[PDB]
From Swiss-Prot:
This is 3',5'-cyclic-AMP phosphodiesterase 4D. Residues 14-337 form the PDEase domain. It is found in: Apical cell membrane; Cytoplasm; Membrane; Cytoplasm, Cytoskeleton. Belongs to the cyclic nucleotide phosphodiesterase family. PDE4 subfamily. AMP binds at H85, D126, D243, N246, Q294, F297. It comes from Homo sapiens. Its main location: membrane. The gene is PDE4D. The chain holds residues 327 to 714 of 809 of the full protein.
Length: 338
């Protein structure tokens, strides 16, 4: 019910560190550990690793100094105090995108500019998040909502901040891209981050299902994507899967994310209570069925998405999907009884 209402109102329209960074290609990287070892700089060290690993600095003539400055600055603009939508969630999504990009079924499909674009999109997609929803911002007549006219209010903001930070001294990581390259990347990045607006979930999902229904493959079984709308769609869904990936992670990672999000939600609901507003679903700490809420979230949102993605990249996502089902199974066993 409040699970039903949440859903309907959200998804509808130096040595140790290096050893841990060796898991950069693995689903279920200990991102919270990397955060601790890096002095709360997971996004920087993770992003830097991915860029060396994918050879992106040579390809795009990005000086490492420029990459590191930009990343440190970007990471600075994620909020200290926000429990979920912080630099660790950013790092997490980036590295999840990284792994999904490297999937066999997608081998040699995307250009380096597209790879660069999905990884950058990931890195910036929640920057300067205040730890409250679009609907909160809309209902409280906030300056951000006025500015962007009630539409993808936060996702427009993240975009604007992430590109704005390029303009600082020695931060222009796209300096050696051509004008054509730069426009192409800018377009792709905007399309992706705006696709992270949760309210678009069902729209995205419908499209992904059509991509699977109309799937064409080479004789070696690799995905054939011959138009821009098809390839940007695949990257939107990929980055959206990365964003709804927490339930698909090893359970000790999953439980931390769940705790952190609930604490961000309760933090909002406190604000709603101080303002005399009706507290949003899943935001009332005095009345929140967490276990049940996760079984619903998986059943109606996460598994549908991931099951379709798994179809698209068959069988590259099977272990991911097996973890998700096991996780669902755990939370189910934990549902409190009278
Ligand atoms: O990634 C997670 C998420 C990650 C871990 C745990 N739970 C999450 N939930 C969640 C939390 C409480 C209740 C429900 N529900 O469906 O009733 C879902 C979520 O909605 N998302 C996606 C999301 C993240 C941030 N804002 C809105 C939605
Ligand atoms: Ca960990
Ligand atoms: Mg977001
Ligand atoms: Zn996010």
């Amino acid at each position: 019910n409040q699970v039903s209402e949440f859903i309907s109102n959200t998804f509808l329209d130096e040595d140790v560190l290096a050893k841990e960074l060796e898991d950069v290609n693995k689903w279920g990287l200990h991102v919270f550990r990397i955060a601790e070892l890096s002095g709360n700089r997971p996004l920087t060290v993770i992003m830097h690793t991915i860029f060396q690993e994918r050879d992106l600095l040579k390809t795009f003539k990005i000086p490492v100094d420029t990459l590191i400055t930009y990343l440190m600055t970007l990471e600075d603009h994620y909020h200290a105090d926000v429990a979920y939508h912080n630099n660790i969630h950013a790092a997490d999504v980036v590295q999840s995108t990284h792994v999904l990009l490297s999937t066999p079924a997608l081998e040699a499909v995307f250009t380096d500019l597209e790879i660069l674009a999905a990884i950058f999109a990931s890195a910036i997609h929640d920057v300067d998040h205040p730890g409250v929803s679009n609907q909160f911002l809309i209902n409280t007549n906030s300056e951000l909502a006025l500015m962007y006219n009630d539409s993808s209010v936060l996702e427009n903001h993240h975009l604007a901040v992430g590109f704005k930070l390029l303009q600082e001294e020695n931060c222009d990581i796209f300096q050696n891209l051509t004008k054509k390259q730069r426009q192409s990347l800018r377009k792709m990045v905007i399309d992706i981050v705006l696709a992270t607006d949760m309210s678009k979930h069902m729209n995205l999902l419908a499209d992904l299902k059509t991509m699977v229904e109309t799937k064409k493959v080479t004789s070696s079984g690799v995905l054939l994507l011959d138009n821009y709308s098809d390839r940007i769609q695949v990257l939107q869904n990929m980055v959206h899967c990365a964003d709804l990936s927490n339930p698909t992670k090893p359970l000790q990672l999953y439980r931390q994310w769940t705790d952190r999000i609930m604490e961000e939600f309760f933090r909002q609901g406190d604000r709603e209570r101080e303002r005399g507003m009706e507290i949003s679903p899943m935001c009332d700490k005095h009345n929140a069925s967490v276990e049940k809420s996760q079984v619903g979230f998986i059943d109606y949102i996460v598994h549908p998405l991931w099951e379709t993605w798994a179809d698209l990249v068959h069988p590259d996502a099977q272990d991911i999907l097996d973890t998700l089902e096991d996780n669902r199974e755990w939370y189910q066993s934990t549902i409190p009884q009278a």
